[PDB]
């Protein structure tokens, strides 16, 4: 009937071995009209009794206390964790099979939902994935590796871009809008990560972690039901004799069972005191409201009585096992009868059974590399910087010109990385700011000479245009690479987990757009190298030609910190350029220095350089070659300040189209930029 705050609480609290925090759970029961619990499941194979009967016990308690309970069928998560031979279609059969077992397990089907992760994520792709990247952005790679146990894996060592999966599970907490995470203790590390993320985004209400007991494995050298033995677990439609065989050979020491120390990772450690027969009694028999067990006429009302009787040898090992076999066979009976008397359900079960000889000890399937594009197509990522140096920008421009010249049939796309640059924490880590700076840098690059034929795309167009296929590409690429391999890209200097996803996204983008070549600056050649690596030398790496406009200080006398005035940027206005060229280093009778270097570059670009000299200083002259120019600077013939005014003149000229945009179209964005520059006080 009707229940109150205190009896609702006692009931919900009894679900979990641990509850972070008890005060929050109480405040939830008092305040919230409908409480949403959730648990998620990798569809990897026949269902273990823990995910069926034991789960059903705890869900019934949750629904009794006035909760909705969501089953998150984690199809993409099983793909990322290399289940069912990594075949997504087979994983979805297993998922359908799981939903049939849960429907026969006697749960309140008015307050239980069965959601598919892929279906739900793709329906809200913009919301979900932004948060996944935001979680990765704000966390270290070390912190995410520590979540390895939620996948039954070991940190470092083997992780294979199984960094994304924990980031996703965490996103989910918020996505489902769950109030209570009601998963097993081995998930505790990612649940804590979700509570950590509330503090990062300033959300005051945190999800309550109501973690449940991890049910023990049947065989002797293991404290959890595993992938090594089919005999470590009872499956949910095991025949009555298979149930008997498994329980009969089970480890069964005559020792009283005490509660385990809650380890920080949550995964149970193997111990000889842990008796899995008694653990089944405690979790699947005595956890149901009115449950009781009986051996030879005696009826034991609580678990303590049955345990006490077994320790003092009033009940024998074979008697206790025969009691459990009966208790389990009664509980699995409804499930067997459903699969015995339904064509659809029976077919699913047969398909799942066929994957025990159909998907394992056969090399796991992985996404195939697409073939090469027929027409050559180059790709170049815009730097997400407030301050793009002129030398870098010039090299981008020249690389696109050089490509078009070499392949007149072909294409060049500049990608604006408005998703992946947020993920890697490029500026302030804020979407608004990163879009602004990319739009600004795009405009100024065109103003400095980027060909009109160059196509411009955002990640946003690419991703939202292919909501499913893009992220499946990313999952495919991620599965095929060790985390250590992506760590090597940054020489072990990865500052956040978002940088790992950024690398995967770039490759996915290069594949989506059918690119034959990737063009790299000095700032991203480490990332684009991965695209070549992944495609097995199919995609070619073109390097930009930098080093032609140097820093303006004296070589061999650099300041410890480079100031703004020591380097030419492409957002420099008239005042900036005058100021930098004024302070720039040059000296008489010297063949080389930064000013001569900038002049030699301008001479190459414009054909010649005209020094305007009032007579008495030598009058006017043109230099049409660099060798003539350095000779006159070395002889003393050309005074430093004469050259300086000539260089200054040409830099203002080349920058005229750009400086017009700085005062007009881009003035809205540039104001929003220089606030984000100051916001980098740190």
């Amino acid at each position, epitope marked *: 009937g009707s229940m109150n705050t205190d009896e609702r609480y006692k009931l919900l609290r009894s679900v979990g071995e641990e509850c972070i925090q008890e005060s929050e759970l109480r405040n939830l029961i008092e305040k919230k009209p409908l409480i949403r619990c959730y648990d998620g499941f990798e569809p990897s194979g026949r269902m273990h009794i823990a995910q069926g009967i034991f789960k059903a016990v705890n869900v019934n308690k949750c629904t009794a206390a006035g909760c909705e309970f969501v089953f998150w069928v984690a199809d993409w998560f099983a793909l990322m964790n290399d289940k069912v031979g990594g075949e997504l279609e087979k994983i979805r059969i297993v998922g359908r099979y799981l939903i049939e077992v849960w429907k026969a397990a006697g749960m309140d089907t008015d307050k239980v939902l069965f959601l598919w992760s892929s279906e739900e994520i793709t329906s809200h792709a913009d919301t979900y994935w932004r948060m996944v990247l935001d979680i990765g952005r704000q966390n270290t790679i070390a912190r995410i590796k520590k979540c390895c146990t939620i996948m039954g894996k070991t940190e470092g060592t083997l992780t294979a871009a199984q960094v994304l999966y924990p980031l996703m599970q965490c996103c989910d907490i918020f996505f489902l809008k769950a109030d209570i995470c009601q998963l097993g203790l081995d998930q505790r590390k990612v649940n804590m990560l979700a509570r950590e993320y509330c503090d990062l985004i300033g959300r005051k209400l945190k999800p309550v972690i109501l973690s449940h007991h991890m049910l023990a494995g049947l065989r002797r050298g293991q404290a959890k039901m595993s992938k090594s033995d089919p005999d470590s677990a009872i499956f949910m439609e095991d025949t009555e004799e298979d149930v008997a065989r498994k329980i009969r050979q089970a480890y069964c020491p005559r020792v009283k069972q005490s509660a385990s120390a809650i380890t920080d990772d949550g995964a149970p450690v193997a111990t000889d005191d842990r008796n899995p027969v008694l653990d089944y009694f405690q979790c699947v028999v005595y956890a149901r409201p009115g449950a009781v067990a009986a051996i030879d006429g005696t009826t034991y009302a609580t678990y303590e009585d049955l345990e006490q009787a077994f320790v003092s040898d009033e009940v024998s090992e074979d008697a206790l096992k025969s009691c459990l076999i009966d208790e389990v066979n009664a509980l699995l009976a409804p499930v067997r009868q459903h699969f015995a008397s339904n064509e659809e359900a029976h077919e699913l079960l047969e398909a799942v059974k066929s994957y025990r000889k159909g998907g394992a000890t056969l090399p796991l399937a992985e996404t195939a590399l697409p073939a090469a594009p027929e027409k050559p197509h180059a790709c170049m990522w815009m730097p997400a910087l407030l301050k793009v*140096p002129l*030398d*870098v920008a010039e090299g981008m421009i020249k690389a696109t010109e050089d490509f078009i010249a070499a392949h007149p049939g072909g294409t060049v796309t500049v990608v604006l990385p408005d998703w992946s640059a947020v993920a890697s924490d490029e500026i302030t880590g804020v979407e608004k700011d990163i879009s602004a700076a990319l739009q600004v840098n795009c405009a100024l690059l065109k103003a400095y000479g980027l060909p009109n034929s160059v196509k411009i795309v955002t990640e946003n167009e690419v991703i939202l245009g292919n909501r499913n296929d893009f992220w499946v590409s990313v999952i495919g690429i991620a599965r095929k690479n060790l985390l250590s391999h992506i760590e090597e*890209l*940054y*020489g072990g*200097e990865l500052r956040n987990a978002g940088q790992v996803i950024a690398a995967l996204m770039r490759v996915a983008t290069a594949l989506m757009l059918s690119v034959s070549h990737v063009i790299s600056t*000095s*700032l991203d*050649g*480490h990332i684009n*190298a991965f695209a070549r690596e992944y495609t097995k030398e199919r995609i070619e790496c073109v*390097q930009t*030609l*930098e*080093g*032609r*406009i*140097p*820093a303006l*200080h004296r*070589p*061999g*006398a*650099a*300041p*410890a*910190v*480079l100031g703004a005035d020591d*380097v030419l940027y492409l957002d420099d206005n008239d005042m900036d350029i005058r100021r930098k060229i004024k302070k720039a280093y040059s000296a008489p009778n010297e063949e*080389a220095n930064p000013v001569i*270097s900038v002049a030699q570059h301008l001479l190459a670009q414009h054909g010649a350089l005209n020094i305007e000299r009032g007579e008495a200083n030598g009058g006017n002259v043109s230099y049409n070659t660099p060798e003539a120019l350095v000779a006159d600077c070395g002889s003393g013939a050309l005074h430093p300040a004469d050259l300086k005014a000539a260089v200054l003149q040409l830099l203002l000229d080349r920058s005229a189209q750009a400086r017009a945009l700085l005062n007009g179209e881009l003035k809205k964005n540039m104001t929003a930029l220089r606030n984000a520059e100051k916001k980098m006080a740190k």
Partner: nanobody
Amino acid sequence: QVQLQESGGGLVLPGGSLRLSCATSGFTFSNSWMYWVRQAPGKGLEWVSRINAGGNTVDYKDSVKGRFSISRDNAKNTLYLQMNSLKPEDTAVYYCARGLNRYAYDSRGQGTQVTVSS
């Protein structure tokens, strides 16, 4: 092949200073990242600073930030490390290395010894 030769090392007192230089050949220095790395006695190689082609992007190991300065002359194919306010912890063989990209280097010169002791 790639050749790199360092010079400028020696013995100084704490609070002293030096300027290392590296002369290079056999590759396109002017379009390459370049590194300074060091090896203290019974320790691994560790990078000290690095600089991109245009001399506009520079990084420094925390312990030398504000005291050391890296620069390059692309015309002369030489790299420079100005070391000021030297400390005993800076004692090491300093090497000049070719950068493949921002986070990696390969070829190294023979090295120049730097010692800071009273």
